[PDB]
Design a protein around this ligand. Structure first.
Ligand SMILES: [Hg+2]
Ligand SMILES: [Zn+2]
Length: 255
């Protein structure tokens, strides 16, 4: 599977039938049909004790891995029940600034989208989590081209180190709190992972307020390669899935 012509998202249904499932992600966030739910609690992000281990180019994107052996960087409150541990974060970006996000707002596409993956700590491990309807909690953040994000530079500078598929690099003392917007106002709905196995275990939490990154910050993302060393070069661009049919699901707003 990939993002090319012959292995693109339009093909994943053959290998992953759930592709056509009832709670597939990403989806379009219609802000007029969105339902302001007053029973929604405030989000509670606790990343002060976070522990980054490494950055890896897995062939479809780069992931910043974290130590999830203890409740170091957890997610609770909001639409959630119980505590969710951060295990990794990654991005989805476009070939141009007019595309890149997975989720759209009133059909509007952003340059990129950041997903912070957390798993329900009553399931013990991540592998168990992915067997439950409420197993995961992905925190989505939209990225727009504007001023540079200081807090993102460290990431930006290491990409040279992992240009191709299978490469990794030590990547400690990375504080995720610098990738967060000022406001924690969100939208939430029951979906799935936007990439294969496409498991329908995610409680999406897409924040309203986007983060701005510079042109040059984004430009470094587009230098990455899908391909592994010593193969023809396939630039890592447009690693996003088109929005899926809501299919009766309802999108709730905290604002
Ligand atoms: Hg599941
Ligand atoms: Zn993602």
């Amino acid at each position: 599977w990939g993002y090319g012509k012959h292995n693109g998202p339009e093909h994943w249904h053959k290998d992953f039938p759930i592709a056509k499932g009832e709670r597939q992600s990403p989806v379009d966030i219609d802000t007029h049909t969105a339902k302001y739910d007053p029973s929604l609690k405030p989000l509670s992000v606790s990343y002060d004790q976070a522990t980054s281990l490494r950055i890896l180019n897995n062939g479809h994107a780069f992931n910043v891995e974290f130590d999830d052996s203890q409740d170091k960087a957890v997610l609770k409150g909001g639409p959630l029940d119980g505590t969710y541990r951060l295990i990794q974060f990654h991005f989805h970006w476009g070939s141009l600034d007019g595309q890149g996000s997975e989720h759209t707002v009133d059909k509007k596409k952003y340059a990129a989208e950041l997903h912070l993956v957390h798993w329900n700590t009553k399931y013990g491990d991540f592998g168990k989590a992915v067997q439950q309807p409420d197993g995961l909690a992905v925190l989505g953040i939209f990225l727009k081209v504007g001023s540079a994000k200081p807090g993102l530079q460290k990431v930006v500078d290491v990409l040279d180190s992992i240009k191709t598929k299978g490469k990794s690099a030590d990547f400690t003392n990375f504080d995720p709190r610098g990738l967060l917007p000022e406001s924690l106002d969100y939208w939430t709905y029951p979906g799935s992972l936007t990439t294969p196995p496409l498991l329908e275990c995610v409680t999406w939490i897409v924040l309203k307020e986007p983060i701005s990154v510079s042109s040059e910050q984004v430009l470094k993302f587009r230098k990455l390669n899908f391909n592994g060393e010593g193969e023809p070069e396939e630039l890592m661009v447009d690693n996003w899935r088109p929005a899926q049919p809501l299919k009766n699901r309802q999108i709730k707003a905290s604002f």
